[PDB]
């Protein structure tokens, strides 16, 4: 369901015996529970959003975070993705839940959205910033975000502390055909776009259990080794940055 | 003893009856305990500093954080202050503890220190950055800090989210004859000086109990109202920023 | 009447005997005369503005400078203030003078005005820039000012030559709940916004008599000591900067 | 022998019959001939270097370009590599040729070399810039290069015209554990370091034959497909940039 | 006919005997042939422009390059000049050729054109950039150029390698009342406006024959000595820069 | 004697009858008197320099301003010129006056002087900045100037208000083989080098009489028409900028 990753300790008690026929079903559910905790945590950083505010999810995938945002704040949520299938599923889902009047996904590039200047209360990129130019996406968020608005991103980034990106990070780039940025670029791009971090938290230790668990599932895609190893040697990190549009 | 402030819930049980003659003595001790928790927390962000590393405390006051740093990591600690009395006390103290061969304070401006380029493992400004130009002090820290080194600052800063600095912040500036900077300047100055935040945490809710407690003591200086009120309306905030020199 | 300050030597002969019952009335009139000389001097720097040009007064107060500008150049003058009372008074005044078809005040933030790009011949901030972000206000002036237009500001600013702002400057900030900027920021902000100083003149010696005089009047608000002392030790200065929009 | 790549049409006549036992030996020699043409072309862009000038090769590998430079200009050549084996081989080689008094390799990081400010006439990175931060390496070259000196680089870079780096580029990064930069970064980094391009030439069409040939040899390492495909779809390009230190 | 200059070796055989009465007519034709080769070369750098694309010629003169562009690509071509006579001639010419539905010139400043954002495929300044501010003209080209579009300029520029501009360059500035820029400014301005050079080629040796030839004609204006001498001592250079709008 | 120009009204009474044989001698003396008033005015902006301070004159010519500076402040004065003859004359002159122990000229480029960082109290470029790169010369002044030091420049600059430099300015560039900068560059370069204008005054009306007078003398060099005409149409201006090193 979710395209982003999870955080939090794994509930091994819930998993039970790996021998059971339903183990894989309890595992996928655990992965899901960790991803929900992640989105929930991202939401904790959006500030006091209200029923009349508009929120924007850049790279919304299936619209799950949008649904969570609305149920939590009762506000309007606009999502953007380049996948027609993802947008369609999200909207069908929204209609079936009877909230399609508040939540909507559309096919559009996150670098040039239809949202008017200063009309969005809060916005975010959950695992979707590693695909685009940071200065350009932050410049767009800074444009539609009202002064005083809140921007949040949960993303993996290489650690400039260990120098250039490790082979593991490059392996991830080649797997998703993305372009993971260094933590230095994230902070620089924000500063250049009137985005001032209020919170920066390294969630690497929190997301490691999610990946080790996934590496033992039938959900493996062959890239979990790059994630785990880079997270462990410190060259790659998972972080949440909450910033104010000033 | 400490020139910086505290964080953490107040132990009212420890305080006891305000009627006792020793209440004031238990209160000052509580304030002290909260300040120690603050320095300890700052230390948790210096990374894995070792016995052979050199640490720099810019605006070290009486040298208490330096003493804590050495006992915790066993490394060398150099402190800088403009107060001859403070430096002298710190060094006497260090000698009496038998660690003057590891810990030393000296009278010097934090904008032009004698430390050689790339020789310091970690450094920090604890409540002392609100006195100097941020670009210049971060440029100096960036100069002596080795590539990969860690810089930490605990400081009060006005929130650019509410616009220009409030009267409360100005009242604080006039009380200490300092120049509190906005959170935007802190992040901008770091980005311009090869300092990349690894952690940014708003400790405002954590330091509020310390000030409310101090406002009921005989330690009042008349400025605690500005602190408390600005911390409450959000115009002023207490934050910890840990950054890597890259 | 005027919200800005004055420049020029005090006419003690005019003041006469402090014992007279009308001394205070002659004093207030003297203060007024010095303020008018100030506005007049600001006007001398607007260039050859004509009857068909449009001028903008950011932070116009009661509209007095606007009235002076029109009578002098016969042009149109648009004023901006956040005070509904001030705007209303200014417009009533304009109507009574029969120039409301040329001079108008409105309630609006000076950072986001309704004036169209490149349509204003000259504009200014008279004692009103110490309240807002300099880059943002100069960016707005630069936007509506035609290429070749003239921008002028008369303002107090702390002197970066003596380092960080003195307690006196902070006391002023706390009194008006403003945010006095250093002279370095004024010049930097202009350079970053296509505003090129044609004239920069330190009027500190010229405005000192105005304040010393006010400090002996019943108009005292308790802040004249901060002004006088900072003007005297050089930490605070009163300057006029006339710049071209290029 | 050479660590960099080649340019120029393949001499199929020279290759002869693939059935011969010596085909592979003629092929490797052809690859070599194309690489020599590349180094020769890089040398054509160093300007009129003379016998008394000093040249620096950053990431010199086995020192082959250095040897070529000396024989061509008779000047002194200093090389830098992180490989002790490579440096040792290069120096042995130089001694055997009787030019070790002019050509020398040493183990050192190209970001912090021992060369004094403004003492080098020309310098270059041949296929070695994709490993380091561009601003930092150009800043170092700009430091030891005399005013008026010449800097040259032959490198692969992703094309910002097609957006973010393609999977092919990422595959190359993962293969060499490097960090290929976009052409935009190359030009930006130079401009920020007083390096002004005099020549920028896309050699992609010229280097394609070298790779297609290598892809049919026993020298294959499995990465030639990424090179060829990205060179063909335009996402990756091979370029020469010659710039003046001004 | 053409306002720009030429490149290529002179066909002395074509010129024939200087004694003939038609020598001057064959010379002017030769100059013309060299100018056409120049425009043709500029066109080779516009990329794969098609019939449905729109091209912009900033400082189009008589519209000759525009005519060439259309016949070559069949696309639409918009030209801008400040000369009403030049625009009128170009359009008459276009009508007579029956291509006025594709090619059009208009009187307009190249710093503020009517072309909509991101609608132009390629654009250029042929010998016309030495008249305007580089940052401003590149900013305008960058505005109407679509992402991925191509910008080309052929221009003379002083060489920052020899320091400040030579007397020869100044003599040229005074002759045309223009403002020749250094090669450093060209590259800097492009980098600041999202224009990334794909090709930079010094055509000085190629344009020298054109000027020496013109210096022997009845077309002399007295400035050919400044051109030739500065081209020869290296202080002035003729270059082509092709860049991508990214 | 002086290489810089003058300011102030011409004393026609002193000139007397143009018919006298000594008219030319009284004229040259008048020109001299106006130049001395200029240097004197520049000196009024150096601040409270004392006997123990060191002053630097970049592009000192014959050392006349240096001599004036010493006699006025009694301080040490170091001069820099590229003319061996000028330096020698200045020093001979200084010795003959018995002040060679305080005033000294030397042959050196003003972009790389031997003065140690932060050791100079005040410095200046009198009519010599139009020859060098502004960022580089201001960066050098900023380097040896102590924090709080004063920098002053009297120079001609083109007015960015009228767009690109006029033919007159170019004619001046060609006459002296210099590179007059726009007023925008002067202010920008200062801001980028920690130089904050304290005074900016347009002396164009004050220097016009000096040039009109010179245009009627036997001292004409043929360039006075460019000066006078550009000063009159506003495209060229003579200004004094006094700035603090902060």
Swiss-Prot record, chains A, B, C, D, E, F:
Coiled coil: none annotated. Keywords: Magnesium, Methyltransferase, Plasmid, S-adenosyl-L-methionine, Transferase. GO terms for biological process: methylation; terpene metabolic process. It catalyses: (2E)-geranyl diphosphate + S-adenosyl-L-methionine = (E)-2-methylgeranyl diphosphate + S-adenosyl-L-homocysteine + H(+). GO terms for molecular function: C-methyltransferase activity; magnesium ion binding; S-adenosyl-L-methionine binding; S-adenosylmethionine-dependent methyltransferase activity. Its EC number is 2.1.1.255. Its cofactor is Mg(2+). Belongs to the geranyl diphosphate 2-C-methyltransferase family. Catalyzes the SAM-dependent methylation of geranyl diphosphate (GPP) to yield (E)-2-methylgeranyl diphosphate (2-MeGPP). This is Geranyl diphosphate 2-C-methyltransferase. It comes from Streptomyces lasalocidi (Streptomyces lasaliensis). The chain holds residues 55 to 300 of 300 of the full protein.
